[PDB]
Amino acid sequence: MLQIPQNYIHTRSTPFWNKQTAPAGIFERHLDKGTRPGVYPRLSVMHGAVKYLGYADEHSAEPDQVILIEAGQFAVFPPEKWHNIEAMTDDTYFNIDFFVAPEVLMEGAQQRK
Amino acid sequence: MLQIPQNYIHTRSTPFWNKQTAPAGIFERHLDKGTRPGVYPRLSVMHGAVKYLGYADEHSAEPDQVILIEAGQFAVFPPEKWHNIEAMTDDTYFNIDFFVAPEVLMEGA
Amino acid sequence: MLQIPQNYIHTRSTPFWNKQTAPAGIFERHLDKGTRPGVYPRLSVMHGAVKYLGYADEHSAEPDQVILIEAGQFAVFPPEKWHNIEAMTDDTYFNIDFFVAPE
Amino acid sequence: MLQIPQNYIHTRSTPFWNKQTAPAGIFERHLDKGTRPGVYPRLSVMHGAVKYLGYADEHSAEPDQVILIEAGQFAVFPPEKWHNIEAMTDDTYFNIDFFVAPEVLMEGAQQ
Ligand SMILES: [Zn+2]
Ligand SMILES: [Zn+2]
Ligand SMILES: [Zn+2]
Ligand SMILES: [Zn+2]
């Protein structure tokens, strides 16, 4: 399973969504982006099941990776990778958390005058 | 398993923690600060495994609820209940997300 | 002006709301609570105008505090104080950010 | 004033920064990381005042946009534009919130 580095930071979260409430576009092929690159999405299924479908590129015809996520489980998605999800039942609902890399700026001994 | 209602709101997320970076007191029997009906914490473990032990009350000798959370899994804990977690390995790391009911986030007159 | 202490941390944000998309209960008298006491709400108006009506207590007949927040401005709401907001137009829309004391 | 469209989504919020705690790079002319159409930063001042300076390009001699932000106010800055900020006082602190269009956060495939 793909893991999010322990030093990554949580930036945003989505409300709980189901087939009807989620933005329609999440069920079609797409890329999850942020302000910066390398954002890791973490989809958690609270009930039912959710399927992740990843592709080689923006136009490949069939998925090159499939992950089934059941209630009580989560899966982090490969960054900058085209994909779409699919709800397995009408009762399925889930939410998504996004994580980004931390910034480490070198500092000096004095303050900036 | 405990499930958090669809209308609940994500209010806070703790950073990733391991045996060393997490608040020492989380491994000791405690009551989540501010816990009350409508406040559900969700613990997801990214690596290793975390064990949750729940107790009927502050001084119960044995727990009445045991949950082993592995990497790729999460568990929602019951509010207003004494408990504690335990990291099963040194490289274990998890984070906790909190969700709360709209009526308690904004209590009307 | 009421200010949020520099050491507080941002915990949550609401999407942009207007008279219709906002949760109804916000236009009615209420209290913002959050998991811990002392939370600070910061309402910023992106367009139109919002008015804050604060009250002495849960049942005061009239408000003891009034603040008009116009586009390009925000206002920090006194914690633990009952209040309700009023959008001044249909075109008005705002969002709320919440800040809490350092963990 | 620039306004962030009502359907945009809050993606990041920086902690409160002052003349010393803010990343040094924000005080010098730069181009925000990942800046592009659909990404608007919103800088609001909690105390003191902050001044934004925008430039036509990277080497323009003079700025062509100036926004003074007092405490209790905020200003949305244009995307893909060279700029820098200046804290008017030592006791000044502020924070920035970034908002992004839904079509940019979730880039739909085309054919
Ligand atoms: Zn996605
Ligand atoms: Zn706990
Ligand atoms: Zn309120
Ligand atoms: Zn900037």
Side-chain angles (χ1 to χ4, degrees):
Chain A
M1 65 169 92
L2 182 54
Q3 306 195 329
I4 294 177
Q6 182 171 180
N7 68 314
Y8 273 52
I9 310 167
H10 176 278
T11 54
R12 68 189 184 86
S13 291
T14 71
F16 285 106
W17 292 326
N18 58 41
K19 278 179 177 176
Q20 296 77 254
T21 55
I26 209 174
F27 301 108
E28 309 173 302
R29 199 182 307 207
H30 66 271
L31 293 179
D32 289 304
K33 295 294 195 59
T35 54
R36 290 169 168 274
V39 188
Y40 279 69
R42 190 185 62 186
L43 191 146
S44 294
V45 41
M46 186 59 72
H47 189 286
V50 168
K51 227 185 195 65
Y52 161 96
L53 296 178
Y55 305 79
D57 55 54
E58 185 185 352
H59 308 296
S60 46
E62 290 301 309
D64 72 331
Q65 171 173 43
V66 188
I67 307 172
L68 178 63
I69 315 168
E70 322 261 51
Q73 306 179 314
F74 74 81
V76 311
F77 304 163
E80 323 291 27
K81 175 169 175 59
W82 290 90
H83 65 287
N84 67 294
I85 66 168
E86 181 187 308
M88 302 309 275
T89 66
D90 312 281
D91 288 69
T92 290
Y93 70 89
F94 55 96
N95 96 292
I96 311 174
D97 298 299
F98 300 84
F99 299 73
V100 191
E103 265 281 47
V104 178
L105 312 171
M106 176 167 85
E107 45 199 296
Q110 292 170 253
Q111 295 187 184
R112 312 139 169 181
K113 188 168 179 57
Chain B
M1 70 179 261
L2 282 279
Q3 302 198 321
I4 299 174
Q6 290 200 55
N7 66 318
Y8 277 48
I9 307 293
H10 177 288
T11 66
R12 195 163 80 66
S13 177
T14 78
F16 286 114
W17 295 323
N18 55 49
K19 292 183 73 175
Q20 290 174 34
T21 57
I26 200 174
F27 308 111
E28 315 307 308
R29 298 180 54 166
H30 66 287
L31 206 51
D32 273 25
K33 313 175 72 180
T35 183
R36 82 185 92 88
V39 187
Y40 294 97
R42 184 188 67 190
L43 197 159
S44 309
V45 337
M46 195 59 265
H47 191 279
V50 168
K51 176 182 290 185
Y52 164 105
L53 298 177
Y55 307 77
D57 65 63
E58 193 185 335
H59 305 297
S60 297
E62 300 297 309
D64 68 352
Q65 185 161 29
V66 188
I67 311 165
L68 183 62
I69 314 172
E70 310 205 74
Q73 306 187 304
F74 73 75
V76 168
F77 307 145
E80 319 188 88
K81 180 168 180 158
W82 287 81
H83 61 286
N84 55 75
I85 61 173
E86 193 190 335
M88 305 310 266
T89 70
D90 275 296
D91 49 30
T92 286
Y93 65 103
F94 55 98
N95 88 296
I96 306 175
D97 296 288
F98 298 88
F99 297 80
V100 312
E103 327 83 66
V104 307
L105 200 53
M106 177 176 78
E107 62 181 67
Chain C
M1 175 186 296
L2 178 61
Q3 315 181 318
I4 297 179
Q6 185 165 186
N7 67 307
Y8 272 52
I9 178 180
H10 165 282
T11 79
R12 173 175 55 96
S13 301
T14 64
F16 290 107
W17 292 325
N18 59 40
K19 283 174 66 62
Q20 187 60 64
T21 56
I26 201 174
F27 301 120
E28 296 186 308
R29 303 177 50 173
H30 66 78
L31 222 62
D32 292 300
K33 302 299 286 301
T35 313
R36 315 180 184 297
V39 183
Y40 277 109
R42 188 193 60 186
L43 190 156
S44 59
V45 179
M46 187 56 61
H47 195 69
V50 168
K51 179 145 65 192
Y52 161 100
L53 294 86
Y55 304 80
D57 59 70
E58 198 187 315
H59 306 293
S60 300
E62 296 173 303
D64 57 9
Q65 191 174 187
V66 178
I67 309 170
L68 189 58
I69 312 171
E70 311 207 307
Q73 315 180 324
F74 69 80
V76 175
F77 293 177
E80 243 64 285
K81 174 174 180 59
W82 297 82
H83 61 285
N84 85 90
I85 66 175
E86 194 188 328
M88 298 314 269
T89 88
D90 288 301
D91 296 301
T92 295
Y93 71 86
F94 60 94
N95 99 296
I96 308 175
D97 288 309
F98 302 82
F99 293 79
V100 174
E103 58 279 63
Chain D
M1 68 167 272
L2 278 82
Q3 301 197 326
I4 299 173
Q6 191 180 169
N7 68 154
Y8 278 45
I9 308 174
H10 179 283
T11 68
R12 187 213 173 189
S13 183
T14 72
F16 289 121
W17 293 329
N18 56 53
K19 199 171 292 181
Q20 311 287 165
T21 52
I26 196 163
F27 298 104
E28 268 49 60
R29 198 177 313 182
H30 60 293
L31 205 44
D32 292 327
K33 296 300 185 61
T35 193
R36 33 108 149 65
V39 180
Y40 297 80
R42 181 185 67 195
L43 195 159
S44 49
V45 176
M46 193 52 78
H47 182 280
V50 176
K51 180 181 293 179
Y52 164 98
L53 293 176
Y55 303 79
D57 55 62
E58 196 188 319
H59 303 292
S60 301
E62 307 300 300
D64 68 346
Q65 176 159 38
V66 184
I67 309 177
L68 180 59
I69 313 163
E70 293 296 307
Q73 308 178 332
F74 71 78
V76 169
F77 309 146
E80 303 170 298
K81 191 190 182 78
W82 288 85
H83 60 287
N84 70 75
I85 66 174
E86 184 179 306
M88 300 310 267
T89 62
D90 293 292
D91 45 69
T92 286
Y93 60 107
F94 57 97
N95 87 294
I96 307 175
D97 293 291
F98 299 83
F99 294 75
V100 186
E103 327 71 47
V104 166
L105 277 178
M106 189 173 295
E107 200 178 306
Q110 292 170 295
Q111 297 181 178

